[PDB]
Amino acid sequence: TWLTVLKKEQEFLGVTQILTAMICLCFGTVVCSVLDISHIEGDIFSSFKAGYPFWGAIFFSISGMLSIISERRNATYLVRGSLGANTASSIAGGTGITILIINLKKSLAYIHIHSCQKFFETKCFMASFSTEIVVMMLFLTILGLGSAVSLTICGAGEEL
Amino acid sequence: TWLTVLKKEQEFLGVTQILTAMICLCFGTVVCSVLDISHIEGDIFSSFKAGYPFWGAIFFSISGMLSIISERRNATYLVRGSLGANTASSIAGGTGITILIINLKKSLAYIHIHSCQKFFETKCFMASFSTEIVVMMLFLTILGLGSAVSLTICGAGEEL
Amino acid sequence: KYWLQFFIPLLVVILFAVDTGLFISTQQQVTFLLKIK
Amino acid sequence: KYWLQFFIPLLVVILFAVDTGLFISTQQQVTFLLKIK
Amino acid sequence: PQLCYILDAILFLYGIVLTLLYCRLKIQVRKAAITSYEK
Amino acid sequence: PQLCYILDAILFLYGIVLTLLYCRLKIQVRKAAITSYEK
Amino acid sequence: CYILDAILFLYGIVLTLLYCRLKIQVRKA
Amino acid sequence: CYILDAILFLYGIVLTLLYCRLKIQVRKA
Ligand SMILES: CC(C)CCC[C@@H](C)[C@H]1CC[C@H]2[C@@H]3CC=C4C[C@@H](O)CC[C@]4(C)[C@H]3CC[C@]12C
Ligand SMILES: CC(C)CCC[C@@H](C)[C@H]1CC[C@H]2[C@@H]3CC=C4C[C@@H](O)CC[C@]4(C)[C@H]3CC[C@]12C
């Protein structure tokens, strides 16, 4: 009975995908605008230095838009393109999750020892700011990737 | 046949009234928040200093709300309140027009004589900025006041 | 430099603005829907 | 201080955004209207 | 010779005209829908 | 224990949850309307 | 800053309550 | 600045074009 209920609910996951794609660009823009990345003393910026939001926003936007249009318009070649975009977004998310995990791993060590006692606004406030931003990014990326994998598994539902 | 056309075409006047009221608040708050309005060498502010942005902000708003709700809900006592709100807004706009006109008179008296040759970016950029802002506000208030007077004359259409 | 802890409210306020816009849209939509005898 | 000539675009951008929202809502409503036989 | 906001002044009028015309159109189409859906 | 940001994060999560759920209801009611007025 | 969250905090509460009202009146209809 | 004004100076063209299309579509309706 899971196949039928997943078939009934298809494009709402596309709605959350496009919301993810639209929202992930803002963090990248503000981080790249307010301050440069190449001279971070703590070297906290590693996921942002590689432009991960730029990598993922376009893929997620394509996936969500294709999923929405597929329900809206029943184009012949659009069905396969939607599955391809879903798979591409799934691989992109699978790489980005590891990227953010290693970013948090390299970010927690600095803050933990001798850098900033207790909470921020003593010497190392910007690192705590970036840590909060990247934790929000990771949580929202998990939320998007769950819908992405659900849509990917739901879309095929048939041989080839 | 004027009365019928005015009666059938009513709530759009409320829409423009509420748009005027909403856009007035933004200008008023930004101008009264960015810099103090009592230490101007030219004493340019002659409207914001007199409360005009906050004089007819929740004043046009109430008239627009009453006008919009009038056709939505035909309450027993709302029709009487709508006419009073409209005529009070007409009087408020009539006062705002003349205070804005004297503000233009003083701003032009400032910029006219020896204060700044040619255009701005010499010593008094704020003078030209305030002049342009108050001209825009005057035009928008004329647009609002015309609709307010039209609604005032439309609403009565009968003895008492 | 130090005002960085200001963009998060800026994001949530516009999120709530577009959210309530969608809410009033769907409110008008369901008001039209209930116009049924 | 000197950057005052920035608020006029700031209001007009949200004005045009709400105009696009109104357009999409009214297009959605008209499309529903059209399908009548 | 001192452009930018001089050319950006008319754009506010553009915005006001469009934001009023859409409101008028939306009210008109709502009225037409109500008058056509009654019977 | 520094306040604000810890209490701000739950507000952020609440905002996304509310907007996503309202979107879900928007699609739900659109399908309900299209399935009701079709006949 | 500290008071800024206060204005928007009950915004969520009122939206949730109005959502509850909307849900009950769509379940009624 | 000037380019920022330019970017929002053609938004009006497309907005008016879709407005006119909506007008002709509702006139057909
Ligand atoms: C992150 C900050 C800076 C900007 C946020 C912009 C967001 C809120 C914008 C960008 C794209 C927009 C979405 C585009 C598509 C849809 C699907 C539609 O059925 C409901 C509106 C909804 C869900 C929009 C909601 C608002 C939205 C998500
Ligand atoms: C200038 C910026 C900062 C704020 C502008 C607020 C204005 C543009 C917004 C706020 C409330 C809005 C109004 C809310 C209610 C209605 C009734 C609806 O049937 C037509 C649209 C209309 C008339 C909206 C028009 C746009 C509106 C007036």
Side-chain angles (χ1 to χ4, degrees):
Chain A
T1 188
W2 62 95
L3 293 176
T4 67
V5 64
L6 265 70
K7 174 172 261 163
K8 180 67 174 66
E9 189 276 331
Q10 286 180 359
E11 65 183 1
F12 167 60
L13 300 193
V15 177
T16 197
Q17 263 154 10
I18 190 167
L19 182 152
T20 300
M22 176 82 50
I23 196 172
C24 294
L25 183 63
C26 295
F27 321 107
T29 60
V30 298
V31 169
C32 298
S33 165
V34 298
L35 56 89
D36 283 358
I37 301 94
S38 64
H39 65 99
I40 305 302
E41 290 84 3
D43 288 326
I44 185 166
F45 279 163
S46 85
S47 55
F48 264 120
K49 204 202 71 163
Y52 164 67
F54 292 165
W55 270 8
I58 175 65
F59 287 163
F60 268 95
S61 65
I62 297 169
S63 314
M65 183 177 176
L66 263 63
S67 58
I68 290 169
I69 301 299
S70 58
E71 273 297 317
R72 260 196 158 280
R73 297 314 150 201
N74 290 318
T76 72
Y77 288 162
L78 172 59
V79 179
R80 270 80 66 192
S82 191
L83 310 181
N86 290 324
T87 61
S89 199
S90 68
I91 311 294
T95 63
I97 292 307
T98 62
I99 294 300
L100 278 71
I101 297 314
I102 201 64
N103 194 32
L104 275 296
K105 180 180 183 293
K106 68 180 294 185
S107 173
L108 60 92
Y110 182 76
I111 302 172
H112 197 28
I113 53 167
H114 190 271
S115 298
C116 185
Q117 201 285 314
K118 212 179 285 292
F119 288 154
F120 71 109
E121 77 259 12
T122 48
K123 283 186 286 293
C124 183
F125 44 100
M126 71 305 297
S128 179
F129 182 76
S130 296
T131 300
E132 185 75 14
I133 301 299
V134 65
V135 175
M136 293 180 183
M137 186 66 204
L138 188 153
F139 182 76
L140 188 153
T141 307
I142 301 299
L143 190 142
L145 189 151
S147 64
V149 65
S150 176
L151 180 57
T152 312
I153 191 167
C154 172
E158 190 42 62
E159 293 215 299
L160 294 174
Chain B
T1 188
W2 292 271
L3 272 298
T4 67
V5 186
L6 267 296
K7 200 61 68 193
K8 63 150 300 194
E9 171 37 34
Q10 183 254 300
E11 51 205 69
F12 181 76
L13 297 191
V15 179
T16 190
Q17 288 204 345
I18 193 66
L19 191 147
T20 296
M22 294 300 293
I23 199 168
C24 181
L25 291 173
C26 204
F27 264 111
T29 186
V30 299
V31 169
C32 199
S33 168
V34 293
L35 183 63
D36 182 83
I37 62 170
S38 178
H39 294 285
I40 301 299
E41 285 84 5
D43 207 306
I44 297 169
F45 301 101
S46 176
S47 57
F48 295 78
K49 186 181 288 293
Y52 170 66
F54 314 106
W55 183 261
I58 315 171
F59 195 94
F60 275 95
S61 180
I62 202 167
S63 311
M65 282 292 179
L66 262 61
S67 55
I68 289 156
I69 302 308
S70 61
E71 261 189 20
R72 299 290 186 84
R73 284 180 249 150
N74 297 115
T76 69
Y77 283 163
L78 190 151
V79 298
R80 175 62 183 86
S82 160
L83 294 174
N86 292 320
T87 187
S89 200
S90 187
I91 287 305
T95 61
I97 291 318
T98 188
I99 62 170
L100 265 50
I101 284 295
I102 197 166
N103 190 212
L104 274 296
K105 186 263 210 183
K106 278 202 312 308
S107 175
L108 269 70
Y110 186 16
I111 193 172
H112 194 275
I113 42 167
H114 184 268
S115 297
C116 182
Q117 196 278 317
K118 73 181 284 294
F119 297 85
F120 69 111
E121 289 301 280
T122 312
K123 197 255 184 181
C124 58
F125 151 76
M126 208 167 178
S128 172
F129 166 77
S130 177
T131 300
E132 185 75 15
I133 295 298
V134 176
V135 175
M136 185 180 288
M137 202 42 169
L138 175 139
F139 164 82
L140 197 148
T141 300
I142 298 284
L143 178 58
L145 165 65
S147 47
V149 167
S150 179
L151 177 57
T152 312
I153 190 167
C154 166
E158 189 63 13
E159 181 181 2
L160 268 161
Chain C
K1 159 200 163 73
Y2 63 94
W3 57 285
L4 277 75
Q5 191 271 330
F6 188 75
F7 182 76
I8 304 100
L10 183 63
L11 183 63
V12 65
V13 63
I14 62 170
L15 194 85
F16 267 79
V18 65
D19 189 359
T20 196
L22 188 143
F23 182 76
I24 62 170
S25 177
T26 187
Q27 183 62 75
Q28 177 272 300
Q29 296 303 71
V30 69
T31 297
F32 206 82
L33 186 148
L34 60 91
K35 175 62 221 83
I36 280 292
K37 174 43 201 83
Chain D
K1 161 200 161 71
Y2 292 166
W3 59 285
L4 282 72
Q5 270 292 321
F6 184 70
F7 166 72
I8 296 167
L10 177 55
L11 63 87
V12 74
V13 66
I14 54 164
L15 186 69
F16 263 79
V18 75
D19 289 333
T20 60
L22 213 67
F23 163 83
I24 191 169
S25 161
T26 193
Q27 183 64 79
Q28 199 287 337
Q29 191 172 111
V30 176
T31 50
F32 188 77
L33 177 144
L34 185 67
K35 183 180 68 65
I36 62 170
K37 318 282 161 303
Chain E
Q2 196 65 43
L3 283 72
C4 177
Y5 74 94
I6 297 171
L7 188 150
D8 197 72
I10 62 170
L11 181 143
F12 176 81
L13 177 62
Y14 202 93
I16 290 295
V17 175
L18 277 191
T19 198
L20 291 203
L21 204 53
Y22 280 167
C23 294
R24 174 183 173 181
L25 175 63
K26 214 198 164 203
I27 308 295
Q28 190 275 299
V29 67
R30 184 181 320 310
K31 211 188 301 310
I34 293 298
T35 55
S36 173
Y37 184 75
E38 57 95 23
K39 197 35 161 53
Chain F
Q2 177 38 51
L3 275 297
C4 179
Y5 64 92
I6 178 64
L7 189 147
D8 187 75
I10 60 171
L11 183 140
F12 169 86
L13 270 75
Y14 211 84
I16 296 89
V17 175
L18 280 190
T19 190
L20 183 63
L21 188 152
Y22 287 179
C23 295
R24 179 181 173 181
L25 187 153
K26 194 213 161 83
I27 296 89
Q28 203 303 320
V29 65
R30 196 161 81 207
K31 313 322 201 53
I34 196 65
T35 51
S36 177
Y37 195 39
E38 57 94 20
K39 180 67 174 66
Chain G
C1 66
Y2 64 92
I3 199 166
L4 181 73
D5 268 18
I7 294 92
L8 188 153
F9 214 80
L10 73 164
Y11 205 106
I13 297 169
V14 66
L15 272 294
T16 44
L17 184 60
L18 183 62
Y19 181 75
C20 171
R21 192 219 70 182
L22 181 153
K23 182 69 76 199
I24 196 65
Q25 63 64 40
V26 298
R27 296 294 86 193
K28 193 52 69 192
Chain H
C1 178
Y2 188 74
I3 297 299
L4 193 145
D5 202 16
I7 299 299
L8 189 151
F9 204 71
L10 73 165
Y11 211 81
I13 297 169
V14 74
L15 202 53
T16 56
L17 188 153
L18 282 71
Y19 166 80
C20 291
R21 185 212 68 183
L22 199 155
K23 187 73 70 204
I24 193 66
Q25 186 255 332
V26 67
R27 181 162 329 142
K28 184 62 221 73

